[PDB]
Write a protein that holds these residues in place. Structure first.
Motif: not given
Length: 188
Positions: A21-24, A58-62
Motif C-alpha cells: 500500500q505504502v512502500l518506502e 520500508k525496504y533497503h536498496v543495493n
C-alpha cells in the motif's frame, strides 16, 4: 487542482500489481535518507496520518555503497525478520554517515549486538532462508518500479511521491505536506 499528477506525485506508466500500500525505499548510505529519517521523520509522520487498514513497508536498496550496501540490505532483512527496525535504524544511519564506524559486515553486526540482539540470534537470522527471501522481496519491489534513486515512496504501486515540487523553507510544513499527499494518494 490542489494535488496534480506531475506535481506532488507522478503516475507510473507501467503500474505494479500486488504492490504494498505504502512502500518506502532508502539506503543507509543515502544523505537525503538520513535527513528523511533522522531529522524530518517522514516515515513516522506518514504513519500518523494514514487511514485505517493501510500498512507501511520500508525496504533497503543495493545500488549505493557497493559491497557494504548489499550487506546492509541483508542486515535490514534481519532487522525486519526480528522486528528490531526501531532499534537499529538510528545506529545504522549514524554508524554509516555520522561516525563512519561501519566499514564491514562485522561492524554492522556490532550495531545489532549493542542494540541487544544476541549474537547467536543475529547470525542464525543472517544465514537463514527466511532472510534470503526477505532480501529477494526488497530487490523485487525495487526492480518492479525501475528504482534508480532514494529516498522514494510509492502508493499502491501506482503513484510516486515527488517532494521536489514542495517548499523546504520550514522543515515541519514540508513533512506534513508530504504526509498529507501520501494520505490523499491513499484515498484515491
Amino acid at each position: 487542482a490542489q494535488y496534480e499528477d506531475g506535481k506532488q506525485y507522478t503516475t507510473l506508466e507501467k503500474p505494479v500489481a500486488g504492490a504494498p500500500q505504502v512502500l518506502e525505499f532508502f539506503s543507509f548510505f543515502c544523505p537525503h535518507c538520513y535527513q528523511f529519517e533522522e531529522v524530518l521523520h517522514i516515515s513516522d509522520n506518514v504513519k500518523k496520518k494514514l487511514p485505517e487498514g493501510v500498512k507501511m513497508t520500508k525496504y533497503h536498496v543495493n545500488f549505493m555503497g557497493g559491497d557494504l550496501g548489499k550487506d546492509l540490505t541483508q542486515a535490514w532483512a534481519v532487522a525486519m525478520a526480528l522486528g528490531v527496525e526501531d532499534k537499529v535504524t538510528v545506529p545504522l544511519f549514524e554508524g554509516v554517515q555520522k561516525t563512519q564506524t561501519i566499514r564491514s559486515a562485522s561492524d554492522i553486526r556490532d550495531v545489532f549486538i549493542n542494540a541487544g540482539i544476541k549474537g547467536e540470534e543475529y547470525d542464525a537470522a543472517w544465514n537463514s532462508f527466511v532472510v534470503k527471501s526477505l532480501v529477494a522481496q526488497q530487490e523485487k519491489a525495487a526492480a518492479d518500479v525501475q528504482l534508480r534513486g532514494v529516498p522514494a515512496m510509492f502508493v499502491n504501486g501506482k503513484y510516486q511521491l515527488n517532494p521536489q515540487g514542495m517548499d523546504t523553507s520550514n522543515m515541519d510544513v514540508f513533512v506534513q505536506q508530504y504526509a498529507d499527499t501520501v494520505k490523499y494518494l491513499s484515498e484515491k
